[PDB]
């Protein structure tokens, strides 16, 4: 609401104008929550972590419901006031997407939020996890899983994929969603907060995020970085709605609050600034503000 939006561009201008956003993203490194990480560090599980320095806290990871190994590289973030839970899992790896459908399924998640593209900075930064075309669908043979394109919506800023999801044992099938924003950059923060602000739109207005399936599943290549941008701004913008005077949502607080459930969530100072930004413009777009209907109309 209308408090609530004041105090957090007077935040930013405070923060923009005193150069402050390093030190802030500091003492967010400084003060994150440290739990031990102890399945992920098994020698097993090796092959299932992409990154040696990113792991699933113990308390808040997502078991798979395997006899064998239960492990995957996910995190359930429930926030508690807000009312929203996110699973933020790491791309997955060539031997791990199977795992990766068997954990949408078991979850019963609606949607999947890709925030990455599987090549960037000339490196594979994520397995190839979904199919590309309709006539070619992919089979999980490690979890009897079965996945079909059935359509996809290409825009601008993002795409947008509806995928059948058949679990082969049991012949079930779900509509899966597949959320891609395609244009993040591969240097620093996307130019157009707007259009963020407007994709994290296009995921609510599914379903998605509703109470109703499971928690959305949401990725970049480690899941940290790109993906705490994402639930950072959701629960923020939800927060600012809420809330009775003082209506203000502390940035900084609901991030530390995130880290509870999995490390280094926002991977920079600057997407720490863009995750403002982003709030404060979907803030705007919500409460009706005609200032910026105008760069919202080609979006
Ligand atoms: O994709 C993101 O936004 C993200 O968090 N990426 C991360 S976080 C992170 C790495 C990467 C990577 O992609 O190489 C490499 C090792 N350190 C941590
Ligand atoms: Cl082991
Ligand atoms: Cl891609
Ligand atoms: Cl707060
Ligand atoms: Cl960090």
């Known amino acids: 609401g209308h408090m609530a939006s004041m105090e957090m ?29 102890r399945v992920a560090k ?99 043979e490690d979890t009897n ?22 679990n082969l044992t049991t012949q079930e099938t779900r509509e899966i969603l597949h959320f891609h924003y395609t244009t993040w950059p591969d240097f620093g923060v996307p130019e157009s907060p707007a259009s963020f602000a407007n994709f994290l739109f296009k995921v609510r207005e599914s379903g998605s995020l509703s109470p109703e399936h499971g928690p959305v599943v949401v990725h970049c290549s480690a899941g940290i970085g790109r993906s705490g941008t994402f639930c950072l701004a959701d629960t923020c913008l939800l927060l600012m709605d809420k809330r009775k005077d003082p209506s203000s949502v502390d940035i900084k607080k609901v991030l530390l609050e995130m880290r509870k ?3 280094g969530l926002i991977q920079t100072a600057d997407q720490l600034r863009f995750s403002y930004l982003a709030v404060i413009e979907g803030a705007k777009f919500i409460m009706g503000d005609s200032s910026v209907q105008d760069q919202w109309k080609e979006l």
């Open 9 to 37: 561009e007077k935040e930013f201008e405070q923060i923009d104008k005193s150069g402050s956003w390093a030190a802030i993203y500091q003492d967010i490194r400084h003060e994150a929550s440290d739990f031990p990480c």
């Open 42 to 140: 098994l020698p097993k599980n090796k092959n299932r972590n992409r990154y040696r320095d990113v792991s699933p806290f113990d308390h808040s990871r997502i078991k798979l419901h395997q006899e064998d190994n239960d492990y995957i590289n996910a995190s359930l973030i429930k926030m508690e006031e807000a009312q929203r839970s996110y699973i933020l899992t790491q791309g997955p790896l060539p031997n791990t997407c199977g795992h990766f459908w068997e954990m949408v399924w078991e979850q019963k998640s609606r949607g999947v939020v890709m925030l990455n593209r599987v090549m960037e900075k000339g490196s594979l930064k994520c397995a190839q996890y979904w199919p590309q075309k309709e006539e070619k669908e992919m089979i999980f």
């Open 145 to 166: 899983l079965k996945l079909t394109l059935i359509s996809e919506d290409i825009k601008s800023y993002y795409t947008v994929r509806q995928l059948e999801l058949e």
């Open 261 to 263: 459930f999995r490390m």
